[PDB]
Amino acid sequence: QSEAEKARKELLELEALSMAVESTGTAKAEAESRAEAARIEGEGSVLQAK
Amino acid sequence: QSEAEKARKELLELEALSMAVESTGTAKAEAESRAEAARIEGEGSVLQAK
């Protein structure tokens, strides 16, 4: 179990790189979508107010 | 499972590019539609008020 643990530390630190991706990628995606929609509304509001 | 995880990080970061598309494209579409309808109303209102 000392041998099935030195490798299991390696399986764990690779899951930490992978879980970084699933989380930073998900939050990056839902936030850049809201920033783009609000830019369209913002450039239109300048014209609409003109 | 360390091997079925170094590849699964690759499957995950490609899903992050793909999920960017489904979200920025959907919000870009529903917001540019509202900007165009409000421009037609806005150019007509100038004539209608004339």
Curated annotation (Swiss-Prot), chains A, B:
Maturation and modification: Phosphorylated on Tyr residues after EGF stimulation.
Source superkingdom: Eukaryota
Comment block on domains: MVP 3 mediates interaction with PTEN.
Tissue occurrence: Present in most normal tissues. Higher expression observed in epithelial cells with secretory and excretory functions, as well as in cells chronically exposed to xenobiotics, such as bronchial cells and cells lining the intestine. Overexpressed in many multidrug-resistant cancer cells.
Compartments, as annotated in UniProt: Cytoplasm; Nucleus, Nuclear pore complex; Cytoplasm, Perinuclear region
Annotated protein name in UniProt: Major vault protein
Complexes and interactors: The vault ribonucleoprotein particle is a huge (400 A x 670 A) cage structure of 12.9 MDa. It consists of a dimer of half-vaults, with each half-vault comprising 39 identical major vault protein (MVP) chains, PARP4 and one or more vault RNAs (vRNAs). Interacts with TEP1. Interacts with PTEN and activated MAPK1. The phosphorylated protein interacts with the SH2 domains of PTPN11 and SRC. Interacts with APEX1. May interact with ZNF540.
Regions crossing the membrane: none
Function: Required for normal vault structure. Vaults are multi-subunit structures that may act as scaffolds for proteins involved in signal transduction. Vaults may also play a role in nucleo-cytoplasmic transport. Down-regulates IFNG-mediated STAT1 signaling and subsequent activation of JAK. Down-regulates SRC activity and signaling through MAP kinases.
Gene this chain is encoded by: MVP
Induction: Up-regulated by IFNG/IFN-gamma.
Location in chain, cross-link Glycyl lysine isopeptide (Lys-Gly) (interchain with G-Cter in SUMO2): K9
